[PDB]
């Protein structure tokens, strides 16, 4: 996940040299942060949505 | 063996792999309490509004 | 045979060394966040590309073949209050007097009850903790005591710190100087008919100097009734006696200025009903008193060195008998340390020339309210405060064998005696040096 | 009828 | 077998020792100029003949048919002060009040503003740091407060140490004793409405002995609005109830001599506006207030025991993980150690009753502009001062692998925490002493 | 295999010890005699029998078919004083005014020259220090100053310790308070226009507490010119203006008693032309004032930790790359330590309530001669002041490899950082445990 | 009209 602040329109993603044997290709949406409830963690005291 | 056969990361997103495995393998129109599988959709007359 | 390989980096041998920190920019900011310097997680990894996490998918290496050891050092440093709740040297449990009244026409009705006493985390030194405990003796009386009868002149409970015995004539039956001299010996607790003190939950028992000589059996409770022989004599009349030259002497003084009631148990004994643990240790009966069941030691204000247990679950291999579990308050330990405390010690002989000045210094008379009564005076202090002082610790515990992977990130967890993170840890870490053992 | 416990005589 | 050769002389074998050291008159004038210790070359070749650099050519060889280590014990002594730049304690961001204005009529506008004050490098001992920090709070005042309307009266933020409830009545709703019982008991910041302190970049914090309950959350902000309940009490009339003596009592002084107003909440309420964080902590709820996610801790003023990590890169193997580079903040690390800084405890009985002789001691009131004012006054001095103080430290870091040709020129690179030189070191050197460990 | 022969008697095997001491009642007589406890000579025979010097003759053999080594701690003491001329603490050069002359019928000529000063040696306490310095700044105005115009008034050069800047208020331009705050915070130097100090030969620099952030560069100058912003501003007329009560304020007293004029810049200025390190530092430009180029640091009587290197040239094999000769003054090295010298710390807050009293204490202003100018007065004396104090060092080396045969006398020699004999050396004496390594 | 803040009485 990488962040998108509002109104920006230009996302550029880096991933330091490494190994892509197996590699299978990508696949990707976009989502609300807002929606997207913070799992680096047991508890999200900043999620308020349902 | 006290060896815990599970080994997880923060990395992986299991439940939306077992939303996408459900839908290969069958009709996921269908609902069934057990489970609370009901999925989620919308009214396609209100997504688009003819 | 002996190699210590990792992702793609040339194999190392022999040994090297792999560091447990906190401190780490990146991993502070994703891994522990909700946790604490007592439980956090780190990457072992060290290496600058890689996101943590991402981390924690590699790992270190050390040869299969053989059996592997590691030398831990660590650092740990604290900074931990001499008096706070979480080592239970807050609170304390004493019983005193809640209400006086005149009752069924004839009647002195005495109500008596337990009451437990808290105190505001961090003040040091063991005089001043005295005084805050003692204070807070007082602060209830203020909200309870002289609104439901009960005078000053019937306090129960006071901690002092003095021999009130020292003027003492074996014939006369009194404290000739007509007042108890004001040098200060070792804490100890006054009592009333009817009350006493309780520390069953409090680590304080340690820092008044005063243990049970049979320790494991919880329950520390000293009622007035067990302080037997040794209730604080009373003291002369110095004022009738002199300007009486028969001899006045047999005059116990019975008040004071403010007119205070010493509570003498009779118009003839030279005796007093306050009675004094000090006393009853060293002049009471040695077979039957208190000295047969209770210790005088030094005080201490650490309130008692406690250890406290290290666990690197994710790294070592668990200790003889401990079985690994997922469970934080039952990780295997891997070392034990005492908990970072010292007793610094150092001479005011200012005290009690300063209690005097003191007074003067704090623009208020709240520990010494009573600047008349000979007893509920404020204690002297003693020449030789001691103060709890923080330290890190430069420890080091032996070799422990390691697991042949080491997982990119490893969990560190300090925990104390009764199994639990530790809050007042401010710094931990510490450095591993693998090596070989023998073959498989 | 009020006891301040404080000694505000010195 | 395992031999040690060097240019032509005769061969060694099983050990000796390679010396890395600052000092040699050689080198400093050539090699390191631009450098400091912390980041310095040194030759490790110690002939008398051969000019340097050109010793840079040779190169002690440790026999190739083996792997060796070596023991690495260093001698590191800084001189690091209390308060500086470099380790964040001489800055501290606080939100004062600017303007007091009359507006539109009748309006009472109060502009309020975040601003960072700065300290004098050095200044240690904890008592006069606070000094320093309130006495910031004012020469900004002076610059700004004043000249837009706002009083002394209302100043906002000062750190004090005191109990400001110790003489508190639980019926009167007042400090009796007409006076903040002047005792220090441990430090805490107090606040009026609308202002706060901010520590988010400052170990400060970590001096006043205040922490947060969950470190690694970035952000230390504490507002007024904080410090809920605990508000300190206000001061009894003394002298209208005792010349009183119905009693007037509820009288609770509302300003001083000099007049300046006590900012009372209410002409009613006993309790001012002025918020404790002390008094929050262990006074205000528990389960909500500020004793919830802060923790009331020991001061120490070496601001937090910060470790230093060494690096040898052309000397030793790169440890485990680390990645060979030539980017002087990232070199792989050989041996991690505190950086040399303890807390020396004081006594001194001789305060407050120094602070009573100290200021006339000093030729100035400066620290104690507000003599009058309970609240503003100058905080009392605490027995048991502490002080950084730096030590030289003889640590010992383990066996390490070397690599089998030793450059004639070694550079030597103390780094902190966030990796960088440290100004503060006066002088580091080490001592390597090779041995065998396996073969090839 | 791994015998240990001597003269005639039985073999011993495995390990044992020889013991290197300079007391023998024996040898001190022969051997060392011009000799001192740094450089002298031993014989490590220990055998009743035998003359010295016959016992030289003797050897003690380790076993030929291995190579040995052997543990080697030693037992070093010393008492060097802190400030002394072999270490470079007693002098140092700063230029000061040397005539003042009405010349050429209108000009006002003034002519500088640079002078070394020198100390008594031993006197320790970095306070009083600092006054035996300006005193010799003084004893030397004695000698030529005044008698050759220059006033008191006019004296360039002078430590103090105190922040010429507290009182300070940002509008008036006037340090109010009317007095130099006289509080002690951090050594400095103050100048007046065209003079300096230089201790490019001492390290009393490090006394002070002020280091060049590039140390490596010789030459540290620190001109009045590089004090750049940062002039002590100038004191409030308290008189004037309190009596005048427009205001006077503005008013910047211009003498003192005595009348000696504070130097000021011109009739308009609040700025005087003395010129404040401490100032400059973190009151001036950071960017490029003297911020830029040195460094505020703990002060550390000692004046530096510097080492010493031991060598046993006729016992231990030369260590890698030294070369054996028989220059006393380049012996291979075989173990380094620091020299013996710690910082005890104290704590006098009987300093300046003592300054007051000690002056009268010592029959003698002979420190404070201007007890009136806010400037040229007594520095106050540090809460907290620091000493060298001499320790014996149990220090420990490594095993260090040995020759297989170990001459009748060993010649032991303590050198210094530039490599000569250290005078202050009272005990030295190391014990030496040999033991095998490997075979030939 | 203007506050030195400085008890000068004292």
């Known amino acids: 996940l990488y962040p998108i602040p509002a109104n920006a329109t230009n996302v550029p993603i880096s991933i330091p040299s490494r190994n892509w044997a197996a590699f299978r290709g990508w696949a990707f949406t976009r989502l609300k942060t807002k929606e997207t409830p913070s799992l680096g963690s047991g508890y999200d005291p900043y999620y308020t949505y349902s | 063996s006290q060896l815990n056969a599970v080994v997880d990361l923060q990395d992986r997103n299991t439940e939306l792999s077992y939303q996408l495995l459900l839908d290969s393998i069958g009709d996921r129109t269908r609902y069934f309490s057990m489970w609370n599988q009901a999925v989620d959709s919308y009214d396609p007359d209100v997504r688009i509004i003819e | ?440 | 009828t009020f006891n301040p416990v404080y000694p505000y005589d010195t």
């Not at chain 3, 008349?372 to 202090?381: F, K």
Request: net charge neutral; aromatic share 10%.
């Open chain 3, 1 to 440: 045979r002996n190699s210590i390989r990792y992702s793609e980096l040339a194999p190392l041998f022999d040994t090297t060394r792999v560091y447990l920190v906190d401190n780490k920019s990146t991993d502070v900011a994703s891994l522990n966040y909700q946790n604490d310097h007592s439980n956090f997680l780190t990457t072992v990894i060290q290496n600058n590309d890689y996101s943590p996490g991402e981390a924690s998918t590699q790992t270190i290496n050390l040869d299969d073949r053989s059996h592997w050891g590691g030398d831990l050092k660590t650092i740990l440093h604290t900074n931990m209050p001499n008096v706070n709740e979480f080592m239970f040297t807050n609170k304390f449990k004493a019983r005193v007097m809640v209400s006086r009244s005149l009752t069924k026409d004839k009647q002195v009705e005495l109500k008596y009850e337990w009451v437990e006493f808290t105190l505001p985390e961090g003040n040091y030194s063991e005089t001043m903790t005295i005084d805050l405990m003692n204070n807070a003796i007082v602060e209830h009386y203020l909200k309870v005591g002289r609104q439901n009868g009960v005078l000053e002149s019937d306090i129960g409970v006071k901690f002092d710190t003095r021999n009130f015995r020292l003027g003492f004539d074996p014939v006369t039956g009194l404290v000739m100087p007509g007042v108890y001299t004001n040098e200060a010996f070792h804490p100890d607790i006054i009592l009333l008919p009817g009350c006493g003190v309780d520390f069953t939950h409090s680590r304080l028992s340690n820092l008044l100097g005063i243990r049970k000589r049979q320790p494991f059996q919880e329950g520390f409770r000293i009622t007035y009734d067990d302080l037997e022989g040794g209730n604080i004599p009373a003291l002369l009349d110095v004022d009738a006696y002199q300007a009486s030259l028969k001899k006045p002497v047999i005059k116990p003084l019975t008040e004071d200025s403010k007119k205070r009631s010493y509570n003498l148990i009779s118009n003839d004994s030279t005796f007093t009903q306050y009675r004094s643990w000090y006393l009853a240790y060293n002049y009471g009966d040695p077979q039957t008193g208190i000295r047969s069941w209770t210790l005088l030691c030094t005080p201490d204000v650490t309130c008692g060195s406690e250890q406290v247990y290290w666990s690197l679950p994710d790294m070592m291999q668990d200790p003889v008998t401990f079985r690994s579990t997922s469970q934080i308050s039952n990780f295997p330990v891997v070392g034990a340390e005492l908990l970072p405390v010292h007793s610094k010690s150092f001479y005011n002989d200012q005290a009690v020339y300063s209690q005097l000045i003191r007074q003067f210094t704090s623009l208020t008379h709240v520990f010494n309210r009573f600047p008349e009564n000979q007893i509920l005076a404020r204690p002297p202090a003693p020449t030789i405060t001691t103060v709890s002082e923080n330290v890190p610790a430069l420890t080091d515990h032996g070799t422990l064998p390691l697991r042949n992977s080491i997982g990119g990130v490893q969990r560190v967890t300090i925990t104390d005696a009764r199994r639990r993170t530790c809050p007042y840890v401010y710094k931990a870490l510490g450095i591993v040096s693998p090596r070989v053992l023998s073959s498989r």
